[PDB]
Amino acid sequence: GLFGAIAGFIEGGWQGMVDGWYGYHHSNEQGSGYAADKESTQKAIDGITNKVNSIINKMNTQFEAVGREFSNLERRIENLNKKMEDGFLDVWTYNAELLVLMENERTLDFHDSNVKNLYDKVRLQLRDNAKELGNGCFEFYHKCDDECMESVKNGTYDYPQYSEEARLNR
């Protein structure tokens, strides 16, 4: 991937993460389990839905062929008419195939960007209070509460709390 998160340093996707697209899997003494990150997942949904619509309502202005008939002494304009309509047909065909192709590719790297952004959001919060295995996971130099976990997800994780147990636990 261009951002290297999906099929990258996070080599595999989660079958068991059915809530949303990207998210978390905590694991502490009080049990583990998958939680979707609803904020990034809804950011991504707003975006993709708007992209489909965009694509559709840009092809609203598209050539609509009409049938005309010519006599056997009108062969030149019958030909011009044919070439003219075939031409608009190929143009607008190229346009749809090439737009789908380019926005498809853009769509993936968007998801790649989002997982990476999410992975960096946690990382930039935990600082040195956690280890970076580099495989998509962070291990806390302290113990983490099921309410401390959600605090990293929420974006409130308190650094000047465990700032002690982590620093003295190395």
Partner: protein
């Protein structure tokens, strides 16, 4: 040590999409945007049945080819359907002047009302019923186009015709008339008496003078003679005036243009499907929320945009592991 991980979705979906750099990429969620199916019927278009011309051409219908009596009186249509090569066109051989321009005007018409403008019985100085050809048989006897009258001399003479018709209707009238080109000068006199003949026609915008051209032609439908047909649109409160001393194929019935709107003349081998649709192609109707279809480029109605692709699929999800 407690641990938190950032991870993404994956499932047992197998649908592939293409990108610029990579084709057949299996994605977790996609959206197909190409409609590829239809019913295979010609359907009423939002409750309005098409006019399906069966084995008759548009010429066969508007002139009243005796093989085309199913269309002697046609209801309003959404669109008209005509075969590639209808068997019943011009029974007596000839040409239809500016035919394609008329078929174009039809794509814009939804309903006619045939009316009698010059009664066949109103020709006391000529023969109005005589009239007929083996090239145009009806039920095993000699017949002719029903909307026009092949006038022949009476008691050995053809007095010059000065006939006018004034359109006292609210609507435009499609008027049709013609001229017969005989194979020899002796057939000419046999039929019309006058060896030198003409047909003049005038309205506020029209001014034509026809002369029958005689030539030796191959037989078509058993005839070496030819019929040549002409039409015009007569505006309300305008009149058409005729003048001829021979070879005149007079109008009897004309067409009131009662409904105008969006129409089309569709070329299709199919016939009425007994269904309803909001989008019809020559191959069958489409019912789809899809923004693209690849069925046929000449469609009628509220249709998805036509592309020539085999497949168009939008990746909505992420790569699938």
């Amino acid at each position: 040590g407690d641990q938190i991980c950032i991870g993404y979705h994956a499932n047992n979906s197998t649908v592939q999409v293409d990108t610029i750099m990579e084709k057949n990429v299996t994605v977790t969620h996609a959206q197909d945007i190409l409609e590829k199916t239809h019913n295979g019927k010609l359907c009423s278009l939002d409750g309005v049945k098409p006019l399906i011309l069966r084995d008759c051409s548009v010429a066969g219908w508007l002139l009243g080819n005796p093989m085309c009596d199913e269309f002697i009186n046609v209801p309003e249509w959404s669109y008209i359907v005509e075969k590639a090569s209808p068997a019943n066109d011009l029974c007596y051989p000839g040409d239809f002047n500016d035919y394609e321009e008329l078929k174009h005007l039809l794509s814009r018409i939804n309903h006619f009302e045939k009316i009698q403008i010059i009664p066949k019985s109103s020709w006391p100085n000529h023969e109005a019923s005589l009239g007929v050809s083996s090239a145009c048989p009806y039920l095993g006897e000699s017949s002719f186009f029903r909307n026009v009258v092949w006038l022949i001399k009476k008691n050995s003479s053809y007095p010059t015709i000065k006939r006018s018709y004034n359109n006292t209707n609210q609507e435009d009238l499609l008027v049709l008339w013609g001229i017969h080109h005989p194979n020899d000068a002796a057939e000419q006199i046999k039929l019309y008496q006058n060896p030198n003949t003409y047909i003049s026609v005038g309205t506020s915008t029209l001014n034509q003078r026809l002369v029958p051209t005689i030539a030796t032609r191959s037989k078509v439908n058993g005839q070496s003679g030819r019929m040549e047909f002409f039409w015009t649109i007569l505006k309300p409160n305008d009149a058409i005036n005729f003048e001829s001393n021979g070879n005149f194929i007079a109008p009897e019935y004309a067409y009131k243009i009662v409904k105008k709107g969006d129409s089309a003349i569709m070329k299709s081998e199919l016939e009425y499907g007994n269904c309803n649709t909001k989008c019809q192609t020559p191959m069958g109707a489409i019912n789809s929320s899809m923004p693209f279809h690849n069925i046929h480029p000449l469609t009628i109605g509220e249709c998805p945009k036509y592309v020539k692709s085999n497949r168009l699929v939008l990746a909505t999800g992420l790569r699938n592991t």
